[PDB]
Amino acid sequence: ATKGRMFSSLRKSLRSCLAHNSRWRVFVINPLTIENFDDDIVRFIKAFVQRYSSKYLHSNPPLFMLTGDYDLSVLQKRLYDAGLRCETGKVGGTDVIIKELFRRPILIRNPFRMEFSLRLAKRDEVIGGPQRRPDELFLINVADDEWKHEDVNVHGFKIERLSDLEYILQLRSDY
Amino acid sequence: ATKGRMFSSLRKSLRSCLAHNSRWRVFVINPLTIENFDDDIVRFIKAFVQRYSSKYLHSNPPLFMLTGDYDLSVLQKRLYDAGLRCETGKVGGTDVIIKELFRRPILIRNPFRMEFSLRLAKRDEVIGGPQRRPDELFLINVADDEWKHEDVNVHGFKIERLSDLEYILQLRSDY
Amino acid sequence: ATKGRMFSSLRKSLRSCLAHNSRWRVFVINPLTIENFDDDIVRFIKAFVQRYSSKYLHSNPPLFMLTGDYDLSVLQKRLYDAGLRCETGKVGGTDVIIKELFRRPILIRNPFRMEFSLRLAKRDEVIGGPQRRPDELFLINVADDEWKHEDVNVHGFKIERLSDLEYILQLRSDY
Amino acid sequence: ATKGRMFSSLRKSLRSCLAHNSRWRVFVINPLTIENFDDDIVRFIKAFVQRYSSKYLHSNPPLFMLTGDYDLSVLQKRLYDAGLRCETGKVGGTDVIIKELFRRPILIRNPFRMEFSLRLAKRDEVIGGPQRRPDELFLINVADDEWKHEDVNVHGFKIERLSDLEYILQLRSDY
Amino acid sequence: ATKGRMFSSLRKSLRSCLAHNSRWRVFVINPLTIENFDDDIVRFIKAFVQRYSSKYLHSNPPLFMLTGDYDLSVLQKRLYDAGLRCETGKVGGTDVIIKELFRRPILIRNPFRMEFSLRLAKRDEVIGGPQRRPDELFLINVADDEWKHEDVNVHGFKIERLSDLEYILQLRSDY
Amino acid sequence: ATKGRMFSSLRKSLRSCLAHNSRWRVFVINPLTIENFDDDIVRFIKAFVQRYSSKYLHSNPPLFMLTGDYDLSVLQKRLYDAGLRCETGKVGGTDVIIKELFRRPILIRNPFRMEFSLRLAKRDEVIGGPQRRPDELFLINVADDEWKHEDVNVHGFKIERLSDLEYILQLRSDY
C-alpha cells in the first residue's frame, strides 16, 4: 500500500504542529477535484472546531479559503444552522476588508463564550497579506500560492476524498 | 469470521464520539428480526444509562425510538420496577407533544438527582421534527428514515442479537 | 488446556461488574460436588470480603446461600474466629425473618467501622424474594433457581475445586 | 532450567499478599540444609525490613523463628551493629512470655520512630500459640508445624541458597 | 540504509542532556557543505527556541556561531520579522565584547517576558574565551575548534541537510 | 557479544540500591589498567553527582578512593574549575583525620545549597575504619580490601573503559 504509507507517515509528521494550543493555521482548498465535498464539508469543520478551537487557551481561530466559483453564503447558512458563527470579513457585503478578517476575538472564561470559532473567505477577494506571517499553510490540491515564503512551513497534498484528511488530522482512526 | 472482523473496526470508529459527556444521540430499532428482544432490552437500556447517563455532566438523555406494533405500556413498568423513570411526552393519554419529549431535565448536584434518565417514544406517533438536529443517529436495522441529513452523522447496521451491540458501544469486552 | 481457556474467557466477561463499588450480588452454591470445600470456604470468604467489602463506598454487602443439608453454626463460629461478622437473619428462633436479612448496615466514615460484612443463610429457609431484585445471581453448580428472571443477569458455572473460582473473580493472579 | 520457571511462578502468587501494609507474617527456617546461612542472614533481614517494615502504616512487624540448635545472641549483636532492634520476648530470664513477643509497638509519625522492627525466637522455646492466627505462614525447608490450620494460608518451599528466596519476596530482580 | 541506524543511536545518546532545563549549550556550523541552508536556518532556530527557550525555568539561552564569510545582518532581520530578539555583543562598533554576549537576561515570571531568546555570532570576530567552559559543544561539519577540552562533552557529527539534525535534536517525529 | 549480557545483567542487579536517596557508597579504583582515565574521570564524577547528589533528600555524599601513586591536587583543582567542591579530611597537614572526612554536611532547603558534594582521598593514607559500616562497596579493578565483611554488599567488576560503568550506573542510556 504505497499510498496508505504516504498518509500514515504524513500523519506522524504533523503531530507536533498540532500539539500547541495557540497557532496561526491557514488552509486553502480546491473543490472541483474532491469527490462529495458539498455533503462532507460541514461535518469536517465542526469536528475540527471541536478538537482545536473549542477551549479558552485556543486563542487564534483557523482560516479556510477556497478557489473556484463556489457560493459561500449557503455554506454560511448551513454552518449557522449547525451551530457555529464565522467572520466573513465584510461590511456591506461588497468586498473584504483585510483588517477585520485577521482580528482577535472576545473571550470570556467563566462562562466560556467565544465570539467566533472560524474564519471563512474566498481567495480572489482577499487582496494583499497579513502583518504576521502564518505558522502553517496547508495546500490541499493547489499547486501554487502567493503566501509561500522561505520562513513559513508549507504542506502540499492530493486527496481524493475528505476522510483522508480527517485521518491525517487526528479526527478518525481508520483510514 | 467475517462479522467478527468488521465489528472491531466499528467499535474503534465510535470511540471518539462516546467520550463526550454532553451530546444528543438518537436510536431507531426494529424488533421483528432481532432474536430474543423482549428479554434483553431492559438490561441493554440499564447498562447504557449507567454508562452514559449516570452523572452530572451528562446533560441531555438519549431517545430510543421503536418501529412497529410494539407495546410500550409494559416496558415502562418493567423499567420502573428496575429503577428508571422515563419521559414519553404524553399529557392526557393520546398524543405526543414534540416540545415535551425533548426538554431539558432538572439536575441537582449535591445530592445527585435526575428528573429522568431516558426518553422513549414510538416512531409513528412522533410526527414532526426537532428544533435542533441530532449529532448522531444510530439506525439499527432500519433502511431509511426522514431525519437523515447531510450535516447529521448516520451509522446503519445489521445485528443478529442484542449482545452484538453491547460490544460496539463498550458495554462488554468479549464477544 | 482447553478448559483453562474457558476460565480465561469468563474472567473478562465479569470485569466491569466488579468495578462497581455498590451492587447487590447473590451466590448459590452446592458443596456435594466440590472437592475440599470445608477446607477452603473460609479462605474464600475472607479474600472476597477483603477485596469487595472493606471500604466505605461498598455499601451493599453480599449474600451466600448454601444448598444441601449442611451445618451453618460451625462455619459461623469459624468466621468469628477469623475476625468477621455475619447477618444470619434470625431472632432467637429457627425461622428466618426476611426483612432483617436484607437490611442496610451502619457505616462510620472516620474511623472505619462496619456493623456486618457478609450475609449468610440457607436456601431452604428463605421463603420469598427481595423487593429490589439482584443485579447479579451467580449459580455455582446449581441448575435452576426461583430468582431467575428476564431482567436479572445470570451466570452459571461448574467447578471442580474452589481455587478455580478465585481466578475468575480476580483474587489469585494465576491459574 | 525447569526449576527456575517454578520460582517465577511462585513469585506472582505472592504479590497480593505482600501489597498489604498491615498484615501478620511468620517464618520458620532450618539452617542445616541451606548453604551460607551465617553469611547472608543479616542482609536478608535488612532488605526485608527496609521494604516491608519501614513506615508508619506498617503496623505489625514480622516473626522469624529458627529451629534446631543455634545461637541467637551473636545474631542479635550483629543486627544491633547493623542498626536494627529486636524483640526477644524475655524479661531477663531464660524463659519466654508469649504476650511480650506478640505485643504491639509504639509508633510516632513525626519524626518517625519505631520501638522495634522485628521479632526473633527459637521454636523449641515458644510453648503455646497466638491469640490471633497468622494470615500467612512461610515454612522454609520444614515439613510440619503445630500452627498449621485449615484457615491459614500455608506456603511451602525447598531452597538451597538464600538468594533464591529474595526473588520470591520481590527484592532481587534476577535469579 | 545503514545511515539511519547511526542517527537513531545519536538520538538516544543525547536524551538526558536535553532534558535538563538549564544548561550552557554551544553550536558551531559550517554552511558551505550543507544544501539549502539559507532556507532552513530560520525554521531550525525557531523550532529549537520553542522547546528549550520558551519558559521561565530555561535560564541560559544558547549560542550559534557560524564559520566562514556569512552575512549576519540579513539573518538578524529575518529573525525579527519572525518574532525573535537576539544578542550579538556589538555596542555600536564592529568590535565584539565577551561580557555582553555571555550575559544573563532579565526574566519576569508572571507575565512572561524575556530580554532575549538566542545568541548569534561569527566565529572569527569572537576572540578570547568564556568564564565557564560549556556543558555541551556541537560541531557540525567542523574538524577542530579551540574550546575543545577534556572536561567538555563534545559531540561531532556530519550532515547533508538540516532536516537530519532536527531528528537528532528531537524536533521532528520521523526521518 | 557475550559481554553485552554480562553488563546488562549487572545493570539490572543494581537498580534497587540506587533508587534509594540516602545511603553510604564507597568506590575503590585502580587506574593503572583503565584506558584513558585522566581524560574521562571528571566527566564521570560530574555525571554521577548530578543525579545522585543534587537534591536535598540526598544526605550522605559518596566517597571516591584511588590506589597507587597518583596526584590528587590536580584533579581537585579541575573539579573546582568545573563547579564542584570536595572534602579531603586534611586540617592543613598532609595527614588525614578520619573523623573529619565522614562528617555530615550543612544543608539548607530553600534556597538550596550544599557545603560539599563529594569526598575524595587516597587509600594508603586512610588508616582506620568508619564507625558505621558501608551499605554498598564498589570495587573496580581491585582484588581485596580491608573493609570487606559479611554484612556489606561487596560488588566487584572488571572494565577497561569508564563508559562501561556509566552504562551500569544508569548515566548513559545505551551501551
Side-chain angles (χ1 to χ4, degrees), chain A residues 39 42-43 46 50 78 80-83 171-174, chain B residues 9-10 12-13 15-16 20 23 132-133 135 150-153:
Chain A
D39 293 328
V42 169
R43 293 179 284 175
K46 181 178 180 181
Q50 187 155 127
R78 300 168 51 180
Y80 168 79
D81 284 323
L171 291 165
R172 69 181 316 128
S173 309
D174 261 354
Chain B
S9 74
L10 183 58
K12 186 187 69 63
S13 181
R15 193 175 50 273
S16 65
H20 293 117
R23 224 160 171 88
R132 179 72 173 175
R133 273 223 182 82
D135 290 330
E150 297 82 3
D151 297 331
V152 175
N153 291 321

PDB file of all heavy atoms in Angstrom, chain A residues 39 42-43 46 50 78 80-83 171-174, chain B residues 9-10 12-13 15-16 20 23 132-133 135 150-153:
ATOM      1  N   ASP A  39     -21.413  17.641   0.553  1.00  0.00           N
ATOM      2  CA  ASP A  39     -22.058  16.849   1.580  1.00  0.00           C
ATOM      3  C   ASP A  39     -21.151  16.580   2.768  1.00  0.00           C
ATOM      4  O   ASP A  39     -21.654  16.309   3.863  1.00  0.00           O
ATOM      5  CB  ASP A  39     -22.525  15.531   0.981  1.00  0.00           C
ATOM      6  CG  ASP A  39     -23.640  15.714  -0.021  1.00  0.00           C
ATOM      7  OD1 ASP A  39     -24.448  16.651   0.152  1.00  0.00           O
ATOM      8  OD2 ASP A  39     -23.713  14.924  -0.984  1.00  0.00           O
ATOM      9  N   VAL A  42     -19.305  20.227   6.162  1.00  0.00           N
ATOM     10  CA  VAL A  42     -19.709  20.793   7.444  1.00  0.00           C
ATOM     11  C   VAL A  42     -19.317  19.874   8.591  1.00  0.00           C
ATOM     12  O   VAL A  42     -18.862  20.335   9.645  1.00  0.00           O
ATOM     13  CB  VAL A  42     -21.213  21.080   7.445  1.00  0.00           C
ATOM     14  CG1 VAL A  42     -21.681  21.393   8.822  1.00  0.00           C
ATOM     15  CG2 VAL A  42     -21.508  22.210   6.556  1.00  0.00           C
ATOM     16  N   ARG A  43     -19.554  18.573   8.437  1.00  0.00           N
ATOM     17  CA  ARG A  43     -19.068  17.605   9.409  1.00  0.00           C
ATOM     18  C   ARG A  43     -17.593  17.823   9.713  1.00  0.00           C
ATOM     19  O   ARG A  43     -17.176  17.815  10.881  1.00  0.00           O
ATOM     20  CB  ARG A  43     -19.333  16.201   8.878  1.00  0.00           C
ATOM     21  CG  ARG A  43     -20.815  15.878   8.802  1.00  0.00           C
ATOM     22  CD  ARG A  43     -21.125  14.504   8.253  1.00  0.00           C
ATOM     23  NE  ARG A  43     -20.984  14.412   6.811  1.00  0.00           N
ATOM     24  CZ  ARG A  43     -21.118  13.283   6.133  1.00  0.00           C
ATOM     25  NH1 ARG A  43     -21.389  12.158   6.772  1.00  0.00           N
ATOM     26  NH2 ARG A  43     -20.978  13.282   4.817  1.00  0.00           N
ATOM     27  N   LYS A  46     -16.988  21.178  11.732  1.00  0.00           N
ATOM     28  CA  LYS A  46     -17.431  21.027  13.109  1.00  0.00           C
ATOM     29  C   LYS A  46     -16.478  20.147  13.903  1.00  0.00           C
ATOM     30  O   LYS A  46     -16.171  20.450  15.060  1.00  0.00           O
ATOM     31  CB  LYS A  46     -18.844  20.467  13.128  1.00  0.00           C
ATOM     32  CG  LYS A  46     -19.428  20.291  14.499  1.00  0.00           C
ATOM     33  CD  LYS A  46     -20.842  19.770  14.412  1.00  0.00           C
ATOM     34  CE  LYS A  46     -21.434  19.591  15.799  1.00  0.00           C
ATOM     35  NZ  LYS A  46     -22.815  19.045  15.763  1.00  0.00           N
ATOM     36  N   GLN A  50     -14.271  21.398  17.043  1.00  0.00           N
ATOM     37  CA  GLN A  50     -14.493  20.752  18.326  1.00  0.00           C
ATOM     38  C   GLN A  50     -13.197  20.260  18.932  1.00  0.00           C
ATOM     39  O   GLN A  50     -13.094  20.158  20.158  1.00  0.00           O
ATOM     40  CB  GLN A  50     -15.473  19.594  18.186  1.00  0.00           C
ATOM     41  CG  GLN A  50     -15.881  18.997  19.509  1.00  0.00           C
ATOM     42  CD  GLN A  50     -17.226  18.302  19.463  1.00  0.00           C
ATOM     43  OE1 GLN A  50     -17.349  17.142  19.853  1.00  0.00           O
ATOM     44  NE2 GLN A  50     -18.248  19.014  19.007  1.00  0.00           N
ATOM     45  N   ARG A  78     -25.643  27.076   6.351  1.00  0.00           N
ATOM     46  CA  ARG A  78     -25.634  25.714   6.867  1.00  0.00           C
ATOM     47  C   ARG A  78     -24.816  25.625   8.144  1.00  0.00           C
ATOM     48  O   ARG A  78     -25.213  24.945   9.094  1.00  0.00           O
ATOM     49  CB  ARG A  78     -25.097  24.759   5.812  1.00  0.00           C
ATOM     50  CG  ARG A  78     -25.885  24.731   4.535  1.00  0.00           C
ATOM     51  CD  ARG A  78     -25.128  24.010   3.464  1.00  0.00           C
ATOM     52  NE  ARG A  78     -24.667  22.712   3.907  1.00  0.00           N
ATOM     53  CZ  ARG A  78     -23.968  21.884   3.151  1.00  0.00           C
ATOM     54  NH1 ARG A  78     -23.643  22.227   1.923  1.00  0.00           N
ATOM     55  NH2 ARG A  78     -23.590  20.717   3.629  1.00  0.00           N
ATOM     56  N   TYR A  80     -24.290  28.024  10.260  1.00  0.00           N
ATOM     57  CA  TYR A  80     -25.057  28.676  11.312  1.00  0.00           C
ATOM     58  C   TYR A  80     -26.090  27.722  11.879  1.00  0.00           C
ATOM     59  O   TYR A  80     -26.256  27.615  13.097  1.00  0.00           O
ATOM     60  CB  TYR A  80     -25.720  29.936  10.769  1.00  0.00           C
ATOM     61  CG  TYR A  80     -26.757  30.521  11.681  1.00  0.00           C
ATOM     62  CD1 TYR A  80     -26.392  31.284  12.769  1.00  0.00           C
ATOM     63  CD2 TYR A  80     -28.100  30.311  11.457  1.00  0.00           C
ATOM     64  CE1 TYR A  80     -27.329  31.811  13.605  1.00  0.00           C
ATOM     65  CE2 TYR A  80     -29.043  30.838  12.293  1.00  0.00           C
ATOM     66  CZ  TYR A  80     -28.652  31.589  13.362  1.00  0.00           C
ATOM     67  OH  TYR A  80     -29.596  32.120  14.201  1.00  0.00           O
ATOM     68  N   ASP A  81     -26.808  27.028  11.004  1.00  0.00           N
ATOM     69  CA  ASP A  81     -27.799  26.078  11.480  1.00  0.00           C
ATOM     70  C   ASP A  81     -27.146  24.924  12.222  1.00  0.00           C
ATOM     71  O   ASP A  81     -27.751  24.350  13.132  1.00  0.00           O
ATOM     72  CB  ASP A  81     -28.628  25.561  10.314  1.00  0.00           C
ATOM     73  CG  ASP A  81     -29.643  26.567   9.835  1.00  0.00           C
ATOM     74  OD1 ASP A  81     -30.219  27.282  10.681  1.00  0.00           O
ATOM     75  OD2 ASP A  81     -29.866  26.646   8.611  1.00  0.00           O
ATOM     76  N   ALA A  82     -25.915  24.575  11.849  1.00  0.00           N
ATOM     77  CA  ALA A  82     -25.159  23.571  12.587  1.00  0.00           C
ATOM     78  C   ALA A  82     -24.829  24.036  13.995  1.00  0.00           C
ATOM     79  O   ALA A  82     -24.794  23.223  14.922  1.00  0.00           O
ATOM     80  CB  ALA A  82     -23.884  23.218  11.831  1.00  0.00           C
ATOM     81  N   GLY A  83     -24.537  25.320  14.172  1.00  0.00           N
ATOM     82  CA  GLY A  83     -24.287  25.848  15.496  1.00  0.00           C
ATOM     83  C   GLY A  83     -23.121  26.802  15.616  1.00  0.00           C
ATOM     84  O   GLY A  83     -22.799  27.240  16.721  1.00  0.00           O
ATOM     85  N   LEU A 171      -8.721  12.936  13.555  1.00  0.00           N
ATOM     86  CA  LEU A 171     -10.158  13.037  13.729  1.00  0.00           C
ATOM     87  C   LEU A 171     -10.891  11.729  13.494  1.00  0.00           C
ATOM     88  O   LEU A 171     -12.021  11.591  13.974  1.00  0.00           O
ATOM     89  CB  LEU A 171     -10.732  14.098  12.789  1.00  0.00           C
ATOM     90  CG  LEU A 171     -10.354  15.535  13.123  1.00  0.00           C
ATOM     91  CD1 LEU A 171     -10.649  16.439  11.976  1.00  0.00           C
ATOM     92  CD2 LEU A 171     -11.068  16.008  14.361  1.00  0.00           C
ATOM     93  N   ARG A 172     -10.308  10.776  12.774  1.00  0.00           N
ATOM     94  CA  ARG A 172     -10.854   9.434  12.668  1.00  0.00           C
ATOM     95  C   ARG A 172      -9.693   8.459  12.623  1.00  0.00           C
ATOM     96  O   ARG A 172      -8.677   8.727  11.978  1.00  0.00           O
ATOM     97  CB  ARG A 172     -11.740   9.263  11.433  1.00  0.00           C
ATOM     98  CG  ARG A 172     -11.024   9.298  10.136  1.00  0.00           C
ATOM     99  CD  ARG A 172     -11.978   9.151   8.971  1.00  0.00           C
ATOM    100  NE  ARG A 172     -12.981   8.109   9.167  1.00  0.00           N
ATOM    101  CZ  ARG A 172     -14.294   8.280   9.034  1.00  0.00           C
ATOM    102  NH1 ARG A 172     -14.798   9.457   8.698  1.00  0.00           N
ATOM    103  NH2 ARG A 172     -15.114   7.258   9.236  1.00  0.00           N
ATOM    104  N   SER A 173      -9.840   7.329  13.311  1.00  0.00           N
ATOM    105  CA  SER A 173      -8.713   6.419  13.460  1.00  0.00           C
ATOM    106  C   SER A 173      -8.465   5.611  12.189  1.00  0.00           C
ATOM    107  O   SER A 173      -7.321   5.482  11.745  1.00  0.00           O
ATOM    108  CB  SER A 173      -8.964   5.525  14.659  1.00  0.00           C
ATOM    109  OG  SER A 173      -9.298   6.298  15.796  1.00  0.00           O
ATOM    110  N   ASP A 174      -9.514   5.045  11.599  1.00  0.00           N
ATOM    111  CA  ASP A 174      -9.340   4.116  10.488  1.00  0.00           C
ATOM    112  C   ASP A 174      -9.201   4.860   9.173  1.00  0.00           C
ATOM    113  O   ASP A 174     -10.002   5.744   8.859  1.00  0.00           O
ATOM    114  CB  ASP A 174     -10.507   3.127  10.381  1.00  0.00           C
ATOM    115  CG  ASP A 174     -10.200   1.767  10.998  1.00  0.00           C
ATOM    116  OD1 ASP A 174      -9.047   1.540  11.419  1.00  0.00           O
ATOM    117  OD2 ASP A 174     -11.117   0.919  11.057  1.00  0.00           O
TER     118      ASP A 174
ATOM    119  N   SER B   9     -13.523  -2.925  13.867  1.00  0.00           N
ATOM    120  CA  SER B   9     -13.301  -1.633  13.244  1.00  0.00           C
ATOM    121  C   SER B   9     -14.410  -0.665  13.597  1.00  0.00           C
ATOM    122  O   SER B   9     -14.163   0.533  13.765  1.00  0.00           O
ATOM    123  CB  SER B   9     -13.225  -1.796  11.734  1.00  0.00           C
ATOM    124  OG  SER B   9     -14.512  -2.040  11.204  1.00  0.00           O
ATOM    125  N   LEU B  10     -15.634  -1.168  13.731  1.00  0.00           N
ATOM    126  CA  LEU B  10     -16.747  -0.282  14.045  1.00  0.00           C
ATOM    127  C   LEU B  10     -16.703   0.160  15.502  1.00  0.00           C
ATOM    128  O   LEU B  10     -17.004   1.316  15.817  1.00  0.00           O
ATOM    129  CB  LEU B  10     -18.045  -0.990  13.705  1.00  0.00           C
ATOM    130  CG  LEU B  10     -19.393  -0.325  13.858  1.00  0.00           C
ATOM    131  CD1 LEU B  10     -19.494   0.945  13.050  1.00  0.00           C
ATOM    132  CD2 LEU B  10     -20.379  -1.336  13.355  1.00  0.00           C
ATOM    133  N   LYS B  12     -13.967   0.597  17.075  1.00  0.00           N
ATOM    134  CA  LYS B  12     -12.904   1.587  17.129  1.00  0.00           C
ATOM    135  C   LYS B  12     -13.335   2.895  16.481  1.00  0.00           C
ATOM    136  O   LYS B  12     -12.824   3.963  16.833  1.00  0.00           O
ATOM    137  CB  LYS B  12     -11.671   0.995  16.454  1.00  0.00           C
ATOM    138  CG  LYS B  12     -10.406   1.803  16.534  1.00  0.00           C
ATOM    139  CD  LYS B  12      -9.298   1.194  15.688  1.00  0.00           C
ATOM    140  CE  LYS B  12      -9.568   1.313  14.207  1.00  0.00           C
ATOM    141  NZ  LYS B  12      -9.603   2.735  13.836  1.00  0.00           N
ATOM    142  N   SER B  13     -14.274   2.826  15.542  1.00  0.00           N
ATOM    143  CA  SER B  13     -14.720   4.013  14.824  1.00  0.00           C
ATOM    144  C   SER B  13     -15.410   5.015  15.740  1.00  0.00           C
ATOM    145  O   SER B  13     -15.265   6.230  15.563  1.00  0.00           O
ATOM    146  CB  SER B  13     -15.651   3.611  13.689  1.00  0.00           C
ATOM    147  OG  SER B  13     -16.078   4.738  12.955  1.00  0.00           O
ATOM    148  N   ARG B  15     -15.134   5.415  19.155  1.00  0.00           N
ATOM    149  CA  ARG B  15     -14.564   5.682  20.468  1.00  0.00           C
ATOM    150  C   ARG B  15     -14.511   7.170  20.771  1.00  0.00           C
ATOM    151  O   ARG B  15     -14.629   7.568  21.936  1.00  0.00           O
ATOM    152  CB  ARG B  15     -13.178   5.071  20.558  1.00  0.00           C
ATOM    153  CG  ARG B  15     -12.596   5.013  21.951  1.00  0.00           C
ATOM    154  CD  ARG B  15     -11.264   4.271  21.967  1.00  0.00           C
ATOM    155  NE  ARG B  15     -10.334   4.766  20.952  1.00  0.00           N
ATOM    156  CZ  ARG B  15     -10.292   4.335  19.693  1.00  0.00           C
ATOM    157  NH1 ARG B  15     -11.111   3.378  19.285  1.00  0.00           N
ATOM    158  NH2 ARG B  15      -9.417   4.852  18.841  1.00  0.00           N
ATOM    159  N   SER B  16     -14.337   8.001  19.748  1.00  0.00           N
ATOM    160  CA  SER B  16     -14.194   9.434  19.965  1.00  0.00           C
ATOM    161  C   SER B  16     -15.516  10.046  20.391  1.00  0.00           C
ATOM    162  O   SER B  16     -15.566  10.863  21.317  1.00  0.00           O
ATOM    163  CB  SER B  16     -13.675  10.106  18.701  1.00  0.00           C
ATOM    164  OG  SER B  16     -14.614   9.999  17.647  1.00  0.00           O
ATOM    165  N   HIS B  20     -17.537  12.208  24.731  1.00  0.00           N
ATOM    166  CA  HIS B  20     -18.138  13.491  25.057  1.00  0.00           C
ATOM    167  C   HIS B  20     -19.262  13.317  26.060  1.00  0.00           C
ATOM    168  O   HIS B  20     -20.178  12.516  25.860  1.00  0.00           O
ATOM    169  CB  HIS B  20     -18.663  14.171  23.801  1.00  0.00           C
ATOM    170  CG  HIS B  20     -17.596  14.593  22.846  1.00  0.00           C
ATOM    171  ND1 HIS B  20     -17.491  14.085  21.573  1.00  0.00           N
ATOM    172  CD2 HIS B  20     -16.583  15.480  22.981  1.00  0.00           C
ATOM    173  CE1 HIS B  20     -16.463  14.639  20.961  1.00  0.00           C
ATOM    174  NE2 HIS B  20     -15.894  15.491  21.793  1.00  0.00           N
ATOM    175  N   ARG B  23     -24.085  15.365  24.657  1.00  0.00           N
ATOM    176  CA  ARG B  23     -24.397  15.165  23.254  1.00  0.00           C
ATOM    177  C   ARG B  23     -25.843  14.715  23.129  1.00  0.00           C
ATOM    178  O   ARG B  23     -26.485  14.328  24.109  1.00  0.00           O
ATOM    179  CB  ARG B  23     -23.465  14.148  22.617  1.00  0.00           C
ATOM    180  CG  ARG B  23     -22.959  14.547  21.267  1.00  0.00           C
ATOM    181  CD  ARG B  23     -21.726  13.789  20.924  1.00  0.00           C
ATOM    182  NE  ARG B  23     -21.323  13.990  19.542  1.00  0.00           N
ATOM    183  CZ  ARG B  23     -20.541  14.974  19.124  1.00  0.00           C
ATOM    184  NH1 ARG B  23     -20.075  15.875  19.975  1.00  0.00           N
ATOM    185  NH2 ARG B  23     -20.235  15.062  17.848  1.00  0.00           N
ATOM    186  N   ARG B 132     -33.542  21.576  17.048  1.00  0.00           N
ATOM    187  CA  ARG B 132     -32.133  21.357  16.792  1.00  0.00           C
ATOM    188  C   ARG B 132     -31.924  19.931  16.309  1.00  0.00           C
ATOM    189  O   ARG B 132     -32.693  19.024  16.634  1.00  0.00           O
ATOM    190  CB  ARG B 132     -31.348  21.595  18.080  1.00  0.00           C
ATOM    191  CG  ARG B 132     -29.864  21.394  18.025  1.00  0.00           C
ATOM    192  CD  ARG B 132     -29.164  22.485  17.265  1.00  0.00           C
ATOM    193  NE  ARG B 132     -27.720  22.327  17.371  1.00  0.00           N
ATOM    194  CZ  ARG B 132     -26.837  23.078  16.730  1.00  0.00           C
ATOM    195  NH1 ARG B 132     -27.245  24.053  15.926  1.00  0.00           N
ATOM    196  NH2 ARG B 132     -25.542  22.853  16.897  1.00  0.00           N
ATOM    197  N   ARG B 133     -30.926  19.762  15.487  1.00  0.00           N
ATOM    198  CA  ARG B 133     -30.695  18.492  14.832  1.00  0.00           C
ATOM    199  C   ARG B 133     -29.861  17.557  15.682  1.00  0.00           C
ATOM    200  O   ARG B 133     -29.085  17.992  16.536  1.00  0.00           O
ATOM    201  CB  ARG B 133     -30.035  18.724  13.487  1.00  0.00           C
ATOM    202  CG  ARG B 133     -31.049  18.951  12.407  1.00  0.00           C
ATOM    203  CD  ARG B 133     -30.722  18.220  11.161  1.00  0.00           C
ATOM    204  NE  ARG B 133     -31.696  18.512  10.122  1.00  0.00           N
ATOM    205  CZ  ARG B 133     -31.669  19.592   9.355  1.00  0.00           C
ATOM    206  NH1 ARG B 133     -30.715  20.497   9.509  1.00  0.00           N
ATOM    207  NH2 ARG B 133     -32.601  19.765   8.433  1.00  0.00           N
ATOM    208  N   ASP B 135     -26.869  14.922  16.658  1.00  0.00           N
ATOM    209  CA  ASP B 135     -25.456  14.823  16.343  1.00  0.00           C
ATOM    210  C   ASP B 135     -25.142  13.461  15.757  1.00  0.00           C
ATOM    211  O   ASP B 135     -24.395  13.354  14.779  1.00  0.00           O
ATOM    212  CB  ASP B 135     -24.621  15.093  17.586  1.00  0.00           C
ATOM    213  CG  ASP B 135     -24.672  16.539  18.017  1.00  0.00           C
ATOM    214  OD1 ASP B 135     -24.842  17.417  17.147  1.00  0.00           O
ATOM    215  OD2 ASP B 135     -24.536  16.801  19.228  1.00  0.00           O
ATOM    216  N   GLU B 150     -27.500  15.587   5.443  1.00  0.00           N
ATOM    217  CA  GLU B 150     -26.080  15.612   5.138  1.00  0.00           C
ATOM    218  C   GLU B 150     -25.266  16.000   6.360  1.00  0.00           C
ATOM    219  O   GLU B 150     -24.263  15.358   6.690  1.00  0.00           O
ATOM    220  CB  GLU B 150     -25.824  16.591   3.999  1.00  0.00           C
ATOM    221  CG  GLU B 150     -26.490  16.238   2.696  1.00  0.00           C
ATOM    222  CD  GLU B 150     -27.946  16.653   2.640  1.00  0.00           C
ATOM    223  OE1 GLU B 150     -28.430  17.268   3.613  1.00  0.00           O
ATOM    224  OE2 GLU B 150     -28.608  16.366   1.621  1.00  0.00           O
ATOM    225  N   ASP B 151     -25.687  17.047   7.044  1.00  0.00           N
ATOM    226  CA  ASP B 151     -24.991  17.601   8.190  1.00  0.00           C
ATOM    227  C   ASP B 151     -25.205  16.805   9.469  1.00  0.00           C
ATOM    228  O   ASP B 151     -24.805  17.269  10.538  1.00  0.00           O
ATOM    229  CB  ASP B 151     -25.446  19.040   8.391  1.00  0.00           C
ATOM    230  CG  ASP B 151     -25.088  19.930   7.225  1.00  0.00           C
ATOM    231  OD1 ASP B 151     -24.076  19.653   6.550  1.00  0.00           O
ATOM    232  OD2 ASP B 151     -25.820  20.906   6.975  1.00  0.00           O
ATOM    233  N   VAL B 152     -25.826  15.633   9.391  1.00  0.00           N
ATOM    234  CA  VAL B 152     -26.032  14.755  10.535  1.00  0.00           C
ATOM    235  C   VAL B 152     -25.394  13.400  10.278  1.00  0.00           C
ATOM    236  O   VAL B 152     -25.621  12.791   9.228  1.00  0.00           O
ATOM    237  CB  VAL B 152     -27.527  14.588  10.843  1.00  0.00           C
ATOM    238  CG1 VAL B 152     -27.724  13.608  11.935  1.00  0.00           C
ATOM    239  CG2 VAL B 152     -28.141  15.920  11.213  1.00  0.00           C
ATOM    240  N   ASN B 153     -24.596  12.934  11.234  1.00  0.00           N
ATOM    241  CA  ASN B 153     -23.895  11.669  11.091  1.00  0.00           C
ATOM    242  C   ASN B 153     -24.855  10.508  11.283  1.00  0.00           C
ATOM    243  O   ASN B 153     -25.781  10.573  12.097  1.00  0.00           O
ATOM    244  CB  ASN B 153     -22.767  11.554  12.102  1.00  0.00           C
ATOM    245  CG  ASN B 153     -21.636  12.500  11.827  1.00  0.00           C
ATOM    246  OD1 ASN B 153     -21.259  12.725  10.677  1.00  0.00           O
ATOM    247  ND2 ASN B 153     -21.059  13.034  12.880  1.00  0.00           N
TER     248      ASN B 153
END
